[PDB]
Amino acid sequence: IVGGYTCGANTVPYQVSLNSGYHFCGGSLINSQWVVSAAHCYKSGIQVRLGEDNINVVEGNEQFISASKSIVHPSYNSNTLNNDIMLIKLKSAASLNSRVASISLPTSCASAGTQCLISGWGNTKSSGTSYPDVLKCLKAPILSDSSCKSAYPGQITSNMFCAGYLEGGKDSCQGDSGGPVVCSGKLQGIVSWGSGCAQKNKPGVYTKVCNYVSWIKQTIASN
Numbered sequence: 001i002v003g004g005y006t007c008g009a010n011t012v013p014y015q016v017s018l019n020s021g022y023h024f025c026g027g028s029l030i031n032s033q034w035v036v037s038a039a040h041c042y043k044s045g046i047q048v049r050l051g052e053d054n055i056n057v058v059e060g061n062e063q064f065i066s067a068s069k070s071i072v073h074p075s076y077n078s079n080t081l082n083n084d085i086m087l088i089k090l091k092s093a094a095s096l097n098s099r100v101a102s103i104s105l106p107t108s109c110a111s112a113g114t115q116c117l118i119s120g121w122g123n124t125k126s127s128g129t130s131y132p133d134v135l136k137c138l139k140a141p142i143l144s145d146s147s148c149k150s151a152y153p154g155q156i157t158s159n160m161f162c163a164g165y166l167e168g169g170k171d172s173c174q175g176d177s178g179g180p181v182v183c184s185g186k187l188q189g190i191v192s193w194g195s196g197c198a199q200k201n202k203p204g205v206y207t208k209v210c211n212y213v214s215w216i217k218q219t220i221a222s223n
């Protein structure tokens with residue numbers, strides 16, 4: 001997260017870290033057994049880390065649970081990042097408490113201008129590299145479809161939306177991939193892609209979760 005702020009420990013209790021020997025992506029806990037992340041975060045050997053603030057220190061509220069299965073969306077296209085969504089099933093159910101909590105799926109698609117919360121442990125610099133240990137947060141509005149398409153001509157599908165600031169300075173970044181965009185208490189976006197971080201006229205692009213609720217519900221009912 002570039003240009004954001006330190007969230008505060010466990011104030012984003014649905015935020016997860018995906019660890020394969022190191023943190024490599026975020027995700028969102030949607031019930032005690034399932035995490036939503038980006039398809040471009042797929043890899044084998046995932047451990048889901050819940051209840052995290054400092055990802056380099058065991059502070060006492062964590063739950064570490066191995067994935068039993070990962071399900072990348074059947075229509076994910078890794079060249080266009082269309083349908084950039086993946087479900088991860090936990091080998092055992094998380095214990096839900098004030099520091100480990102699920103986020104609801106949307107029933108409608110959030111509107112342009114809505115202010116959302118984006119979070120993660122990704123790079124905090126728009127030039128160069130600095131990775132934080134504690135969770136970072138960013139408040140950002142959803143941008144109009146026309147602004148989004150003007151920023152990335154020929155690249156925005158109906159399963160994507162832009163959020164952020166066309167002036168630059170505030171964005172998600174590498175390492176935030178797969179993490180949540182939450183608006184009105186629902187998971188509306190997944191950190192997906194962009195061009196650089198916090199660059200002028202290049203806002204973040206996010207998977208439009210409302211388009212996937214039927215697939216999510218049917219998949220978790222059968223796996």
Ligand SMILES: Nc1cc(CNC(=O)[C@@H]2CCCN2C(=O)[C@H](N)Cc2ccccc2)cc(N)n1
Pocket residue numbers: 040171172173174175176177191192193194195196197203204205
């Ligand atoms: N820039 C940016 C990045 C992010 C997070 N997602 C990435 O870091 C993805 C992961 C792979 C690289 N990547 C890109 O977004 C690349 N800029 C374009 C690309 C995509 C996929 C494969 C190759 C190249 C959030 C925001 N808001 N902005």
Ligand SMILES: [Ca+2]
Pocket residue numbers: 052053054055056057058059062
């Ligand atoms: Ca920790």
